[PDB]
Scaffold this active site. Structure first.
Site, PDB file in Angstrom:
ATOM      1  N   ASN A  69      -8.851  -2.037  -1.694  1.00 45.27           N
ATOM      2  CA  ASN A  69     -10.136  -1.783  -1.055  1.00 45.27           C
ATOM      3  C   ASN A  69     -10.442  -0.298  -0.909  1.00 45.27           C
ATOM      4  OD1 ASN A  69      -8.205  -1.461   1.185  1.00 45.27           O
ATOM      5  ND2 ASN A  69     -10.049  -1.389   2.458  1.00 45.27           N
ATOM      6  N   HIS A  70      -9.446   0.573  -1.046  1.00 45.07           N
ATOM      7  CA  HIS A  70      -9.665   2.010  -0.959  1.00 45.07           C
ATOM      8  C   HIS A  70      -9.887   2.655  -2.316  1.00 45.07           C
ATOM      9  CE1 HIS A  70      -8.086   2.982   3.346  1.00 45.07           C
ATOM     10  NE2 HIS A  70      -8.856   1.910   3.322  1.00 45.07           N
TER      11      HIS A  70
ATOM     12  N   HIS B 247      -4.376  -7.690  -3.224  1.00 42.17           N
ATOM     13  CA  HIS B 247      -4.412  -6.697  -2.156  1.00 42.17           C
ATOM     14  C   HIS B 247      -4.944  -7.301  -0.865  1.00 42.17           C
ATOM     15  CE1 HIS B 247      -4.837  -2.961  -0.001  1.00 42.17           C
ATOM     16  NE2 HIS B 247      -6.119  -3.214   0.183  1.00 42.17           N
TER      17      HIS B 247
ATOM     18  N   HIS C 278      -2.866  -5.600   2.345  1.00 47.74           N
ATOM     19  CA  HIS C 278      -3.955  -4.816   2.912  1.00 47.74           C
ATOM     20  C   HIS C 278      -3.723  -4.418   4.369  1.00 47.74           C
ATOM     21  CE1 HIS C 278      -7.740  -3.161   3.782  1.00 47.74           C
ATOM     22  NE2 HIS C 278      -8.415  -4.260   4.065  1.00 47.74           N
TER      23      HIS C 278
ATOM     24  N   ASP D  55      -4.604   0.411  -2.940  1.00 45.17           N
ATOM     25  CA  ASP D  55      -4.595   1.441  -1.895  1.00 45.17           C
ATOM     26  C   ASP D  55      -3.620   2.569  -2.250  1.00 45.17           C
ATOM     27  OD1 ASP D  55      -6.545   0.071  -0.601  1.00 45.17           O
ATOM     28  OD2 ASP D  55      -5.482  -0.151   1.301  1.00 45.17           O
TER      29      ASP D  55
ATOM     30  N   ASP E  87       0.829  -1.195   0.000  1.00 47.12           N
ATOM     31  CA  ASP E  87       0.000   0.000   0.000  1.00 47.12           C
ATOM     32  C   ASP E  87       0.866   1.249   0.000  1.00 47.12           C
ATOM     33  OD1 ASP E  87      -1.884  -1.914   0.241  1.00 47.12           O
ATOM     34  OD2 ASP E  87      -2.846  -1.096   2.035  1.00 47.12           O
TER      35      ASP E  87
ATOM     36  N   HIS F  41      -0.907   4.405  -0.235  1.00 52.79           N
ATOM     37  CA  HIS F  41      -1.865   5.176   0.561  1.00 52.79           C
ATOM     38  C   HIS F  41      -1.632   6.680   0.449  1.00 52.79           C
ATOM     39  CE1 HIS F  41      -4.847   2.706   2.361  1.00 52.79           C
ATOM     40  NE2 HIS F  41      -3.988   1.884   2.938  1.00 52.79           N
TER      41      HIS F  41
HETATM   42 MN    MN Z   1      -4.767   0.016   2.985  1.00 58.24          MN
HETATM   43 MN    MN Z   2      -6.449  -2.002   1.764  1.00 54.43          MN
END
Ligand code: MN
Ligand code: MN
Lengths: 322, 336, 290, 275, 60, 575
Positions: C112-113, C162, C236, C80, C52, C54
């Site tokens: 997931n983001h 992920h 994740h 992410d 990630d 982010h």
């Molecule tokens: Mn994440």
């Molecule tokens: Mn994630």
């Protein structure tokens, strides 16, 4: 370049020289009287700036915004459509009424068309479109009668008399083709309207208005086989309808040389011939064997597997079969 | 503070896929975490003891008992493996022993000195299992029989493994392999038909037969609603009507603390005498018998008396149907 | 086009965001490129598998300094890209630009983001509003996110992803047959693909995140043997050591955002796969910021 | 159908190795690709199917052009061994079709059936042999429903503007509709939609296969629907006596698909008429 | 399950497949020139890792 | 009623979505153009007088110069910006204050005293502290154009605002006091500002004393040289040992210009006890802040007395600042300590700073090592390579194998400095095992820095040294199974072709690059194409069309898109 700026000046629309303006004006006007009338007049002005081309407005604007725009167009003109008869009406109100009926019949045709479903305000708009569609289902015959009367009353901004008649009879033919699924007798009226618009489009030769030539050609091809009153495909269909099965065999033998017919079409006609032979008509066994032999030979020449029916037909070989 | 003892089925029949794609043991673990979430929604559960007993051997059966924190309980609940036999009776005996081993050293039972409803350690056993047959490495059993082979010292004084303040609830998992279309699943949860059902009903509890995740959530909400502090009293009809289902009920009375306070005991089933060397074994639920004849409540000033609210039951529905709060139904235990 | 893409990449290297028409011509070309890619995209070794990011853009620059520049180093990012980094817009724009310019030297997966709701909640939508005024760029990026491949497969052995596995997923053919062109649902195999975590547990379980599941060693072993896989790469979850082996070295969790949230103090890592799957981990501190 | 380390390790190598380990057992072997001649495959299949037709036909002029009737019991045996070979579990072994929402419940089984059909092209020939006897294709209902749901799931996720970018899935959809029409599980009007499948985008053919699922929900492939016409010795499915058996509501989607693509499907309108 | 391969302390725990790589890793470890298998629940220790880490300075 | 812009269209967009509200506020210029210039200031501004919405409103009203009509009617903007100045929210407050400051440029001095100074009257005398803070932030622009009689009123109002009972009014007064003092008359500064500055420096709140110290350097700068010791220096002395750590951290952060402001003779007598106290404070933050400015304070002293003030106080405190408990203080000191050597002198650097340098070069905090390595050039210049090789060379050789890659990056970047003053034989027997081991590093930045360092080494020590040492080690990376070692040896090709001449390049470097064009990894192959493009003009032109072009066409016929693109780029550039 916003909703507020266009309402301010009475001349900036000429400086803009648009469907986004249409949807913005009709969304702001329908939000929960002088401002609403001014926005509606501006929306009608920019709609007329596109010369009332229903294709662009139909693909850009959705159903309820376009319904509100044409309802405003009818509201400012005259303000019941079936009894107007478009005879003593002014030409502007007459073309507006036939334009509204053209849009209505176009949307009731287009609502039957399948569309890709979205995977995952909008619900209220969907309910509004469903209500509008049900209302125009209740008033489709009146719009059809109005369009037919406008096609019959070719008395006379101002556009060519044939072009508006060509567009309205094209929409009438599309309506009759859409209706013809339930009742096969409507296909005769569909073919009549499609021949009328084909003759009109050949006569005028003017782009101006604009219709889909490929769609018209496909409509004519469909009406030429649904109500025939040429190609080997239509020859096979005609000889199937007339029962001239030996000519079907001859066309298939000739098609084995050219490989022009679809393989799945020949499989389908073989299947329906077997279905006909399995009920009665004991002379159809010979026809079934002959068309199965032709199909098997074509399967060989294209490098595909021998069908089960061919092996079933040589369980008992004969001099005639071989 | 209540004791929540979970008797997770760790027999190998718990490795059955549902339509969810997870095994019955996975559903059991998830049912436990969802139960603990719904229990933590109640802000009166700041002090609450969680215990874990599996179906394994008695060296390994108790996974979390007394003086085990939350972290060990969760870390051992996650790491359960369904690789055993369906030894339901032995596991129930070990669970009741884990509930009752402290009773004689701290004297909650108050043997021979009256049955004090305020002397309680309120615990419920939530056993999560399936409808599979019980197996004891020699065959199937088709009837639940708790073994009495190595009795804890003093177990003969109560003649039943469960106690006054213990209720056994069964969460029987019957999730099918393929999803079943049903619109009547929003109704009440049926009682299960396995061997755990009579043993749940004799302790004042009940068995839940789930068939879907929403039925599972409904049963978990009902089980959260049944975590109370009280003791189970067997009510019986003494005389004639003033057999209908209100005649007998193993209902629950409520013991509300302020530590609970109280003065009078429920009397014993015998008359105490110093000639008898052995204390008579008493039933774990005191069989009280109410008089159906109407009487008058008799209360004087400054009087130490204890009022216990009965939980909703067919008996309380029958009493409230005959709307008369000015009268009362006298109750007594037999052979006292 | 190619020169314009290179100019955009060297502009985005120093955190200058692209314009609205640039986001138009970039996202609607990444839509064309990502359409051809399957759900289980076949990544060929060598590749550097990353966790990630982010939205931590300067940490992504540190990542590029550690592992190498694209297109020289093949990268595989497991989602992410956004959501509570200070420069999520620049990060996702730069990685999408690298995907467009070098389609075979970087594979970007969905995390997931990259859902519409998750970016609405956790500050990517707010970052787009702050950096652009309107909101069309956010939904442009989420429409691109709908096109992102769910999983990656390196040599048929390392299954990069992920999130984790699903109760409803037993094969990679299930993943290939998933309709990935959709918003991430609250439940289902796609949500479990993007949201699940591993655990030290005896089977399946409900994840504490409220979406996806959690799985133990036996599930990972069954999935690996049933699909011919030797490893399941994952990104994740947050790792203080950067990378963490799980389930007897069947699942490795790789976090590539050092000092996550600018407060966690983690020390992130990336996984470099060799020519013959000889893995190597490059842990790196958060980059200095002046 | 489809299908000395340490010496050179030391020779390859304060001189520590760069990598930290190995992922699995090194690289995989470069596949197991093989090629067999298509002609010999065709004629081996022809030998097997001719033997099966000889076994399945009733022994014992019945016209010089007639064919012996394939026994529905023999083709039923072929049908049940097909079902047990391809989809052995048969958790949905009941012949009537479930709702279309049950397709997402059995994705793994249906994808196994679809992959099995892709790997073995002989399965389609065996279904064609089964479908030659009318009541026998009812016993392959699990296989037909599984392949149909796998194809429907494929046309869900097909992002191509046309259908020719999925050649196996296109010809499998066409062959599936052709087999169900040949086995008379579909009326001739609804059984002809496979001819236009090549001219459609994936969502129209998905809607057409969903209409096929709807018809098979409403009517069902059940052997009691087949009446043994003793005059010719063949079981006959009369769709007219079923009530709405000519695709009453199910032909509406087909006609709408023809109407939408009338610029290409105009000449095909003769195959989908009411008579 | 609790095998705990002491490969750096016991030579019998080293597989033949990676004997040379583990050999040169042991040689690098002993001379002047497993870890990161934290059990998941402790690999994301937000409070625990910063507590052992020294505190920084505070803002103006 | 309906077509009226300000009355209807502005009002009806206020009930929409908040983003639509922002859009309608941003589109206020078109509404201003709709009404007349009289109509705008007659209707919209009284309407506007009666948090992003307010921020955008104040931003629009700042640039509302020509829309109201011009400079003659800009004073109508005073009531609405007064309304937003009273708002409790603070970014709206200083946005309105800076909007007032921006629009103050278009006023006339008569118009200024007529309108803009009564705003100061109202805001300073407002019952809410928000108006008073706005007035404190507002004083700067009205002063230069108005007359002295109202300048005295402005000074008195500033004094009254600094004496407010609420603390944040005093905070906003002290934060903007420096800007006010930068323009106010120097004769009146000593009369008015500095006693009130002393009072707000002796405030009961540390937050006020923070901004008191923040403006102390500007007051010392504006006040003349002859009166610093009696007017601004007692306040600095009082703030030096103040109780709070925040205010002392503020004192420590500003020495590097406070010393320049108060004049060096005053510094060398008075600041060095305060500076020495801030060296040895009982807390980490002010210690680190004061240790940032050790070199800056030392280098800005008197030439004759620079050594004694260091040796008496600073360096004895440096001796435990090096061994400080908090590593942040050590890292703060380590970035500036090692530049003291040109100030201190070579003959006394060796016995004092060199053990400190060696102590800081082995610190467990990587930030300390990274900060101390980055200033090696000063010590190398002022001492010499013999003493550096005796003392610091084993240390830097030791931490060239550091765990943290930025330390190694600094070491690589400073290798050309050592190679400048060292012989080829000493550098061979000491400093090439690490120089070649950096090429097989795990970090790309380290390998890139080593590759760029190879050019600097070769261009000094000769083609013969290149061929003797670097070329076999670089060629060892060609057959390496790992892919990025091969890309490293092609980057070495890129940096070595230009410095190895023509013949050596075309007879050693070229055959390897042509050999490795058949590598199964595409990242190697397009790098072969790029390297053949780069070394093309450098190598011998006789071999170009003979050898490079066929393999460039072969790479142009590759399966990968990027290999084809870089091969055709190499073909076009090579031509
Ligand atoms: Mn994440
Ligand atoms: Mn994630």
């Amino acid at each position: 370049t916003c909703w507020f700026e266009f309402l301010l000046e009475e001349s900036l629309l000429e400086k803009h020289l648009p469907v986004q303006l249409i949807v913005q004006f009709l969304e702001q006007a329908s939000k929960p009287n002088k401002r609403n009338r001014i926005l509606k007049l501006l929306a009608l002005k920019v709609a007329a700036h596109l010369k009332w081309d229903l294709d662009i407005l139909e693909k850009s604007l959705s159903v309820p915004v376009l319904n509100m725009l044409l309802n405003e167009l009818l509201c400012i003109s005259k303000v019941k459509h079936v009894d107007m008869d478009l005879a003593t009406l002014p030409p502007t109100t007459a073309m507006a009424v036939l334009l509204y009926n053209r849009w209505a019949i176009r949307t009731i045709v287009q609502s039957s068309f399948p569309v890709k479903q979205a995977k995952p305000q909008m619900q209220q708009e969907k309910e509004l479109t469903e209500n509008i569609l049900k209302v125009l289902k209740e008033q489709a015959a009146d719009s059809i009668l109005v369009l037919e009367a406008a096609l019959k009353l070719n008395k006379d901004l101002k556009v060519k008399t044939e072009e508006m008649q060509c567009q309205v009879c094209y929409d009438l033919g599309a309506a009759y083709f859409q209706q013809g699924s339930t009742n096969s007798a409507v296909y005769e009226n569909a073919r009549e309207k499609f021949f009328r618009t084909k003759e009109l489009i050949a006569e005028i030769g003017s782009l101006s208005c604009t219709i889909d030539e490929k769609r018209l050609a496909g409509y004519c091809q469909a009406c030429d086989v649904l109500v025939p009153s040429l190609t080997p495909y239509s020859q096979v269909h005609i000889c199937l309808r007339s029962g001239n099965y030996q000519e079907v065999i001859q066309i298939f033998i000739e098609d084995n040389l050219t490989l022009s017919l679809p393989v799945q079409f020949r499989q389908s006609v073989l299947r329906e011939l077997f279905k006909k032979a399995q009920q009665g008509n004991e002379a159809l066994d010979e026809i079934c064997f002959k068309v199965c032999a032709c199909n098997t030979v074509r399967d060989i020449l294209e490098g595909r597997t021998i069908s089960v029916q061919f092996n079933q037909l040589f369980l008992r070989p004969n001099k005639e079969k071989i | 503070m209540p004791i929540l003892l979970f008797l997770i089925d760790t027999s190998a029949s718990m490795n059955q896929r549902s339509h969810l794609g997870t095994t019955y043991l996975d559903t059991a673990k998830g049912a436990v975490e969802t139960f603990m979430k719904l229990r933590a929604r109640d802000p009166a559960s700041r002090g609450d003891r969680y215990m874990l007993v599996t179906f394994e051997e008695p060296p390994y059966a108790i996974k979390a008992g007394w003086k085990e924190n939350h972290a060990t309980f969760m870390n051992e609940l996650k790491n359960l493996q369904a690789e055993g036999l369906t030894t339901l009776g032995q596991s129930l005996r070990t669970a009741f022993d884990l509930l009752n081993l402290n009773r004689l050293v701290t004297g909650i039972d108050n043997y021979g000195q009256g049955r004090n409803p305020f002397f309680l350690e309120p615990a419920i056993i939530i056993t999560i299992t399936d409808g599979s047959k019980l197996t004891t490495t020699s065959g199937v059993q088709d009837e639940l029989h708790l073994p009495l082979n190595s009795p804890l010292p003093g177990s003969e004084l109560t003649k039943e493994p469960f106690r006054w303040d213990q209720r056994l609830f069964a969460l029987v998992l019957r999730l099918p392999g393929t999803m079943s279309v049903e619109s009547e699943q929003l109704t009440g949860v049926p009682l299960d038909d396995s061997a755990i059902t009579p043993m749940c009903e004799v302790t004042g509890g009940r068995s839940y037969s789930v068939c879907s995740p929403r039925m599972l959530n409904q049963c978990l909400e009902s089980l959260v609603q049944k975590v109370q502090s009280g003791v189970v009293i067997n009510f019986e009809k003494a005389g004639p009507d003033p057999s209908q289902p209100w005649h007998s009920c193993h209902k629950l009375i409520y013991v509300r603390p302020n530590v609970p306070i109280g003065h009078w005991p429920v009397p014993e089933s015998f008359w105490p005498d110093q000639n008898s060397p052995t204390l008579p074994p008493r039933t774990s639920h005191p069989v009280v018998k109410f008089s159906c004849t109407d009487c008058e409540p008799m209360v004087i000033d400054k009087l130490p008396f204890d009022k216990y609210e009965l939980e909703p039951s067919p008996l309380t529905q029958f009493i409230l149907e005959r709307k008369s709060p000015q009268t009362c139904w006298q109750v007594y235990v037999s052979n006292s | 086009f190619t020169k314009e893409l290179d100019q955009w990449i060297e502009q985005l290297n120093e955190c200058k965001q692209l314009s609205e028409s640039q986001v138009k011509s970039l996202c609607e070309k990444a839509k064309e490129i990502l359409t051809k890619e399957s759900n289980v995209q076949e990544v060929r070794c060598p590749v550097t598998v990353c966790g990630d990011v982010h939205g931590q853009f300067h940490d992504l620059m540190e990542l590029f300094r550690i592992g190498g520049k694209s297109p020289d180093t093949n990268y595989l990012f497991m989602g992410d890209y956004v959501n509570r980094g200070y420069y999520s817009v620049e990060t996702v724009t730069l990685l999408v630009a690298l995907k467009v310019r070098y389609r075979e030297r970087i594979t970007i997966l969905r995390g997931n983001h990259e859902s519409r709701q998750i970016t609405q909640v956790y500050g990517f939508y707010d970052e787009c509003l702050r950096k652009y005024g309107n909101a069309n760029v956010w939904k442009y990026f989420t429409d691109l996110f709908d096109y992102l491949p769910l999983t990656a497969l390196v040599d048929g052995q390392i299954f990069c992803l992920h999130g984790g596995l699903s109760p409803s997923i037993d094969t990679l053919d299930h993943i290939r047959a998933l309709d990935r062109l959709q918003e991430v649902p609250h439940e289902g195999p796609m949500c479990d693909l993007l949201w699940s975590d591993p655990d030290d547990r005896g089977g399946w379980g409900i994840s504490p995140r409220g979406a996806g599941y959690t799985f133990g060693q036996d599930i990972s072993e069954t999935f690996n043997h049933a699909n011919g896989l030797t490893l399941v790469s994952r990104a994740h979850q947050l790792v203080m050591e950067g990378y963490n082996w799980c389930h007897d070295r069947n699942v490795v969790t790789i976090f590539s955002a050092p000092n996550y949230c600018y407060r966690c103090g983690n020390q992130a890592a990336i996984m470099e796969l060799d020519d013959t799957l000889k893995y190597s981990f490059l842990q790196f501190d958060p980059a200095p910021r002046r | 159908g489809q299908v000395a380390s340490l010496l050179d390790t030391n020779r390859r190598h304060i001189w520590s190795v760069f990598h930290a380990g190995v992922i699995g057992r090194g690289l995989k072997p470069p596949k197991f690709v093989q090629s067999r001649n298509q002609q010999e495959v065709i004629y081996n299949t022809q030998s097997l199917l001719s033997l099966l037709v000889h076994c399945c036909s009733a022994p014992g002029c019945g016209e010089c052009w007639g064919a012996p009737i394939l026994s529905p019991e023999a083709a039923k045996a072929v049908a049940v061994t097909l079902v047990e070979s391809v989809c052995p579990d048969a958790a949905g072994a009941e012949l009537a079709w479930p709702p279309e929402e049950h397709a997402r419940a059995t994705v793994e089984r249906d994808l196994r059936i679809g992959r099995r059909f892709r790997e073995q092209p002989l399965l389609f020939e065996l279904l064609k042999l089964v479908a030659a006897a009318p009541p026998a294709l009812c016993y392959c209902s699990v296989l037909l429903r599984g392949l149909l749901a796998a194809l429907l799931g494929h046309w869900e996720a097909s992002r191509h503007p046309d259908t020719t970018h999925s050649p196996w899935h296109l010809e499998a959809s066409c062959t599936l509709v052709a087999v169900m029409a040949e086995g008379s599980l579909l009326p001739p009007a609804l059984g002809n939609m496979h001819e236009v499948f090549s001219q459609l985008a994936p969502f129209e053919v998905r809607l057409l296969l969903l209409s096929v699922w709807g018809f098979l929900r409403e009517h069902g492939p059940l052997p009691q629907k087949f009446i043994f016409q003793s005059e010719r010795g063949r079981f006959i499915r009369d769709f007219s006596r079923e009530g709405g058996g000519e695709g009453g509501p199910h032909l509406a989607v087909l006609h709408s698909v023809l109407h939408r693509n009338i610029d290409r499907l105009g000449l095909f309108s003769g195959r989908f008429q009411a008579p | 399950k609790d095998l705990k391969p002491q490969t750096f302390r016991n030579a019998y725990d080293i597989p033949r497949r990676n004997l040379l790589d583990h050999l040169t890793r042991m040689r690098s470890n002993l001379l002047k020139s497993q870890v990161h298998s934290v059990p998941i629940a402790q690999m994301g220790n937000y409070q625990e890792y910063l507590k052992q880490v020294p505190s920084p300075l505070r803002e103006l | 009623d309906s077509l009226y812009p300000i009355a209807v269209l502005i009002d009806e967009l206020r009930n929409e979505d908040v983003q639509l509200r922002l859009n309608s506020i941003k589109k206020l210029s078109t509404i201003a153009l709709a009404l007349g210039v009289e109509r705008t200031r007659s209707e919209l501004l009284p309407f506007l007088t009666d948090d992003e919405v307010l921020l955008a409103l104040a931003e629009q009203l700042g640039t509302f110069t020509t829309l109201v009509g011009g400079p003659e009617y800009v004073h109508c903007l005073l009531p609405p910006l007064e309304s937003l100045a009273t708002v409790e929210e603070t970014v709206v407050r200083d946005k309105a204050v800076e909007s007032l400051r921006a629009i103050s440029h278009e006023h006339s001095p008569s118009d200024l005293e007529a309108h803009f100074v009564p705003l100061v009257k109202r805001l300073a005398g407002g019952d809410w502290f928000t108006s008073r803070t706005s007035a404190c932030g507002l004083f700067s622009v009205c002063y230069p154009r108005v007359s002295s009689a109202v300048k005295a009123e402005l000074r008195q109002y500033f004094r009254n605002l600094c004496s407010d009972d609420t603390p944040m009014v005093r905070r906003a007064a002290a934060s903007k006091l420096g800007e006010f003092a930068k323009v106010l008359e120097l004769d009146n500064v000593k009369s008015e500002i500095i006693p009130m500055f002393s009072n707000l420096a002796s405030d009961e709140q540390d937050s006020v004393r923070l901004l008191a110290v923040e403006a102390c350097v500007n007051i010392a700068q504006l006040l003349p040289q002859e009166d610093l010791e009696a007017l601004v220096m007692p306040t600095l002395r009082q703030a030096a040992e103040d109780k709070s750590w925040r205010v002392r951290y503020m004192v420590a952060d500003k020495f590097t210009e406070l010393q320049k402001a108060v004049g060096p003779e005053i510094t060398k007598t008075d600041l060095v006890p305060a500076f020495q106290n801030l060296m040895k404070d009982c807390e980490a933050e002010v210690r680190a802040a004061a240790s940032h400015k050790v070199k800056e304070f030392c280098e800005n002293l008197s030439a004759d007395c620079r050594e004694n003030v260091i040796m008496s106080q600073i360096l004895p405190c440096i001796k435990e600042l090096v061994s400080d408990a908090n590593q942040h203080v050590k890292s703060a000191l380590a970035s500036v300590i090692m530049g003291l050597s040109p100030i201190l002198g070579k003959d006394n650097t060796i016995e004092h700073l060199l053990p400190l340098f060696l102590a800081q070069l082995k610190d467990e905090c990587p930030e300390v090592r990274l900060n101390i390595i980055s200033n090696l050039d000063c010590v190398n210049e002022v001492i010499g390579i013999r003493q550096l090789s005796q003392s610091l060379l084993p240390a830097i050789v030791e931490l060239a194998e550091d765990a943290k890659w930025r330390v190694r990056l600094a070491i690589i970047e400073y290798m050309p400095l050592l190679a400048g003053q060292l012989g080829v034989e000493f550098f061979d027997e000491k400093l090439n095992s690490l120089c070649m081991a950096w090429l097989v590093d795990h970090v790309y930045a380290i390998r890139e820095a080593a590759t760029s360092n190879l050019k600097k080494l070769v261009e000094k020590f000769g083609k013969e040294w290149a061929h003797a040492t670097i070329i076999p080690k670089v060629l060892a990376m060609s057959g390496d199974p790992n892919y990025l070692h091969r890309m490293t040896t092609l980057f070495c090709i890129n940096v070595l072709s230009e410095v190895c001449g023509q013949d050596i390049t075309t007879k050693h470097m070229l055959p390897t690059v042509l050999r490795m064009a058949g590598d199964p990894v595409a990242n190697v192959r397009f790098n072969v194409a790029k390297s053949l493009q780069k070394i093309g003009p450098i190598l011998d032109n006789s071999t170009l069309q003979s050898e490079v072009k066929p393999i460039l066409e072969k790479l142009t016929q590759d399966q990968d898109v990027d290999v084809k693109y870089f091969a055709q780029e190499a073909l076009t550039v090579l031509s």
